[PDB]
Structures are given as C-alpha cells and as structure tokens.
Amino acid sequence: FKIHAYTEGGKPLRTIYLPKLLKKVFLDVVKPNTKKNLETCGILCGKLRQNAFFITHLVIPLQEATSDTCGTTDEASLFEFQDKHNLLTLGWIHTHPTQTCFMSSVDLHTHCSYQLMLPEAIAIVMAPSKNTSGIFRLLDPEGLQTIVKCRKPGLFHPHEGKVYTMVAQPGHVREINSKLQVVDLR
C-alpha cells in the first residue's frame, strides 16, 4: 500500500525519500562541534523526480553556532552551489548536542521560511546524547500562521497552542537505501 500524506488544511504533500544513513552520516561529520557543545546545521538538498522528492546531497553551509543555535552566514556559496548543481532545498538538519529532541523557539522560526517555500519541507533534529532523533514540520496552516505572525522578542520566547508535529512516515517521509553525498562548504 501507499500512504498519501496531506496537510492539516487538506493540501497534498509529495513524498520525500531520505537516505536511511543520512542522520548517522550527519552526526559523524559534525562530531567535533558536538563534542564542544556547539550545534551544527546542514541543508537537505535534492531533486523532484516524477512526482516525488529525493534527498541526494547533505550540504554543510558556512555557519555560526552556539550551544543553542546555528545559522548560515554565507548564503552566496550555498546559493551558487545549489544553482550550479540544480538542487532544491528540501529541509534541514541540526544537532542538540546535550538536550532532548524537540523544536526550539528559534527552530520554529527557522523552519517557517523552509516550509513556506516548500510545503513538504522537513526539519530533522538529532539528540546524540540521548540517542534520539525526530523529523518535524509546522502544522499547516495553523502553525505556519502562528510563526508568520509572531514578532515576539528573544531567542527562547514561547508560542501559544500546538505549532508543530512529527512528520508522517512513511507517507510524507520514507527512509530508503539510496545515494547520498556530503558537501562541506566550510
């Protein structure tokens, strides 16, 4: 059987195929930062084939980090790389070096732009010290709207209501044996 995933507003979501080794590959690549209690992020890049998305490239962008944040600092090299290799942005991945697997306030704000651009966009959060991981998205439309309208100050400000959820597997995301390459732009 095939599961057809839909948003909370009833819009169809195209399947994203995620190489099943990507999470482990990401952890091993960013390991030095993880030991120093610094987050690292990566971009999930790939292509649309027939009517489904395939993540084929794990791109580690030029970035800045703390124990609680990470973010791209040179969009240019990232942009030019994706343009040159004809890659779509399908989501992003990051670590919580010591904490549990959840989406923080800043994570929700980060993810909003991804999911506005691509309704299927996903956020993978790795919590290596807990040996846990999760794949998340905002509720659409309700969670997206909450974050879009939010102008509250502070990196850790709370939000009212349910805003995010785990993605449907295997309907929205399915982990499979497939090709992958790492591109470290640092």
In the shown chain, the binding pattern of residues 38 to 77 toward Zn ion, with x for contact by CB under 5 A and - for none, equals ----------------------------------------
The answer to whether 179 and 18 have CB atoms below 8 angstroms apart is no
Q: Whole-angstrom Cα distance, residue 27 to residue 59?
A: 13
CB atoms within 10 A of CB 10: 8
Q: Report, in Å, the least distance between residue 146 CB and Zn ion.
A: 8
Q: Report, in Å, the least distance between residue 152 CB and Zn ion.
A: 5
Cβ distance to Zn ion smaller for residue 62 or 150: 150
CA angle 44, 47, 51 (to 5 degrees): 120
Structure tokens that stand for 90 in this block: 């399908």
Segments in 12-70 forming alpha helices (H): 22-35
The answer to whether 39 and 66 have CB atoms below 8 angstroms apart is yes
Cβ distance to Zn ion smaller for residue 20 or 152: 152
Cβ distance to Zn ion smaller for residue 107 or 140: 107
CA 64 to chain centre: 17
Q: Report, in Å, the least distance between residue 75 CB and Zn ion.
A: 20
Structure tokens that stand for 97 in this block: 């070096």
| Cβ within 8 Å of residue 70, ≥6 positions away | 38, 39, 40, 41, 63, 64, 94
Contact pick of 73, 82, 104, 178 for Zn ion (by CB under 5 A) = 104
- Closest-by-Cβ residue to Zn ion is 150
111 annotated to a ligand binding site: no
Site for Zn ion in 130-169 (CB under 5 A): 150, 152
Cβ distance to Zn ion smaller for residue 54 or 136: 136
Site for Zn ion contains 120 (CB under 5 A)? no
Contact positions vs Zn ion (CB under 5 A): 104, 107, 150, 152
- Residues belonging to the binding site for Zn(2+) are 94, 96, 107, 109, 150, 157, 159
